[PDB]
Amino acid sequence: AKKILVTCALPYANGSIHLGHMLEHIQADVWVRYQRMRGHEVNFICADDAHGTPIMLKAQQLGITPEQMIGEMSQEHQTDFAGFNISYDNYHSTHSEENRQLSELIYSRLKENGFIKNRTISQLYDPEKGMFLPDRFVKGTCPKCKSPDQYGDNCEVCGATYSPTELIEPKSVVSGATPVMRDSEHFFFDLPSFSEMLQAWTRSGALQEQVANKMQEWFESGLQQWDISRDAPYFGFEIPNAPGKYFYVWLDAPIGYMGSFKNLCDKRGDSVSFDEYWKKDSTAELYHFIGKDIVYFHSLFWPAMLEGSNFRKPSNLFVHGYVTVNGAKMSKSRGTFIKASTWLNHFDADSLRYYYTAKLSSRIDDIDLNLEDFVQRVNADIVNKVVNLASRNAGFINKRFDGVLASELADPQLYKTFTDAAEVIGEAWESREFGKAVREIMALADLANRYVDEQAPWVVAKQEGRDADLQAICSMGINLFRVLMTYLKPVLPKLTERAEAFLNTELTWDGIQQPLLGHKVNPFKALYNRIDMRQVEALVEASKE
């Protein structure tokens, strides 16, 4: 029924995808896949965030154009996300003509509407390289404890914090020259002019309660004008009419969501859907899945930019917490800082997808990848509860009954119990209460396994003229599997494909109301194998390096 546009945050082009990213893209993909199952028109959009000083400097160090470097990271990123079956409809780039034209448009509209201010500021500058320095590119000795080689606004030996202008004997991280303070004109977005609009939006009840609470802290501290320009030398979009000035990365980044959607419409030759989704009167829904470190940009600057440039604002923001491994922030030294590519050398995508999904909820809370629990959970739930219903029953059907399932359900009441749960489960996928959905699905799997145990096919199989009873029991367990794999289809796309090939049918949400009767099933290899702690040790060792 509805038209929905969903995004994940745009990953920086200067680093590889890691499990932190993966939590977000998996969360979003499960939700998107469920929405497609319910018949909605869904557009899942992402892109690399490819601008900024860090990127410019990285390319220079490497001796290649920033364009070449971002082109390489974009392919690396898309290869990893494809390996996790993240079902984007379009994956584009913030460094694109669509994003350029939209950034220029929104800025001009903001400026014509009075929201752009000019003010001179003073910042540390490298006279040798000939560039202003962001804080992280200034180093020197801490003014408090006199420890040398400290970077930016804080000291990693005494913990003091200070403006980098307080550093003793400051040095440019780029060239080693001594930086000096230099004036520069900057352009500022007048966020404060949207305060009332944003406060109303905050109290709507749409946003998560935790996000709303955070926003009240930000209004209390006081909204400020936002510096949205950077001087040359920069890798980004040049500001119209302002030679040597560029849009700050964060101004163009969220416009990249629009740019990626415009690109998809344009490649499809679709001249109507861009305005249908982004004009102020849209009836389409717009959702952004993001992490808690970037909520300020998506909940205050972004909606204000859209309002101020006559576009619709987000229908909701869906925020998730950080990932932890073994309970702690990811650690390079313990080998728990794991890239997405490295993960796929050791385990399949489905396992991590399942694990994260079993833990996620509609709140913001850190999600822990406990590696010991990961093995125990995947083996218990996937191999032993869900896939077991197929693996314990298929052999008999294929060997004794020519792959044909019985003509009637052995236990129609039990089947109805399973199809009756569809409403609560789909409501849980829809409300992002993933943990709740998995708990309902696994309680059904426990009932189906109890059913099989109470019928004892391993006993019926060796007894007298009980061929009919065997076929009935085994068909019954295979239909329960059909239903469970339907509920899990958003979570486990490749196991789902294997189950559809076995069952000789695509799984649709409504399809569970018609059990498979007098139906041929195919033989199969092994639908899902067990994993073990040896594999996890290998993963951790590979990541240590």
From the annotation, which residues make up the binding site? 142, 145, 155, 158, 332
What does R_g of the chain's alpha carbons equal in angstroms?
27
Two structure tokens written together for 380: 């218990």
CB of 145 to Zn ion, least distance (A): 3
Burial status of residue 532 (CB atoms within 10 A of its CB: 0-12, 13-18, 19 or more): exposed
Residue 145 interacts with Zn ion (CB under 5 A): yes or no: yes
Please name the residue that has the structure tokens 């560039």: 131
What's the closest the beta carbon of residue 279 comes to ligand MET, in angstroms? 21
Q: Map the footprint of ligand MET across residues 421-450, applying CB under 6 A.
A: none
Total number of residues that touch a copy of itself (CB under 8 A):
30
Question: Any contact of residue 168 with Zn ion (CB under 5 A)?
Answer: no
Q: Which stretch binds a copy of itself (CB under 8 A): 7-15, 289-297, 403-411, 452-460?
A: 403-411
Identify the bridge partners of residue 123 per DSSP, sorted by sequence position.
Answer: 182
* Burial of 110 (C-beta count, 10 Å sphere; 0-12/13-18/19+): buried
269 belongs to the binding site for a copy of itself (CB under 8 A): yes
Query: Who contacts 411 (Cβ-Cβ below 8 Å, separation ≥6)?
Result: 451, 476
Would you say 121 or 158 has its CB closer to Zn ion?
Answer: 158
Write the binding mask 92 to 131 for Zn ion: x where contact by CB under 5 A, - elsewhere: ----------------------------------------
- 255 versus 495: smaller Cβ distance to ligand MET: 255
* Residues ≥6 apart with Cβ < 8 Å to 469: 460
Binding residues for ATP: 332
Q: Cα dist. 512→125, 418, 480 in Å? A: 66, 9, 9
Instruction: Tell me the residue nearest to ligand MET as measured from the CB.
Output: 49
Residue 11 binds which one of ligand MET, a copy of itself, Zn ion, none, with CB within 5 to 8 A depending on kind?
ligand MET
Mark the segment that binds a copy of itself (CB under 8 A) among 197-205, 318-326, 385-393, 450-458: 197-205
Phi, psi of 479 (to 5 degrees): -75, -35
**Which tokens belong to 236?**
């980004």
Closest distance of CB 531 from ligand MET, Å: 30
Distance in Å, CB of 280 to ligand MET, minimum = 21
352 binds Zn ion (CB under 5 A): no
Of residues 54 and 233, the one with the C-beta less far from ligand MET = 54
Q: Which residue numbers belong to the known binding site for Zn(2+)?
A: 142, 145, 155, 158
Residue number with CB closer to a copy of itself (224 or 407): 407
Among the candidate windows 10-18, 72-80, 331-339, 360-368, which touches ligand MET by CB under 6 A? 10-18
Report the sign of the C-alpha dihedral through residues 242, 243, 244, 246, in that order. Answer: positive
Q: How far is the CB of 432 from a copy of itself (least distance, A)?
A: 15
157 binds a copy of itself (CB under 8 A): no
Q: Identify the residue among 24, 49, 285, 307 touching ligand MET (CB under 6 A).
A: 49
> CB atoms < 10 A from the CB of 358, how many?
20
CA gap 374, 357 in Å, rounded: 12
Q: Taking CB under 5 A as the rule, does residue 499 contact Zn ion? A: no
Sign of CA dihedral 19, 24, 29, 30: positive
The answer to whether 158 contacts Zn ion (rule: CB under 5 A) is yes
Sheet with 138-141, side-by-side order of all strands: 150-151, 138-141, 168-172
- Output b/e per residue, 281-311; b: 16+ Cβ within 10 A: ebebbbbbbbbeebbebbbbbbbbbbbbbeb
- Phi and psi at 394, nearest 5°, equal -60, -40
Contacts of residue 199, Cβ cutoff 8 Å, sequence gap at least 6: 219
Binding mask 334-353 for ligand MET (x = CB under 6 A): --------------------
Residue 206 lies near a copy of itself (rule: CB under 8 A)? yes
**According to the binding rule CB under 6 A, does residue 9 interact with ligand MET?**
yes
Binding site for a copy of itself (CB under 8 A): 200-201, 203-206, 269-272, 280-283, 312-313, 315, 401-402, 404, 407-409, 412-413, 513-514, 518-520
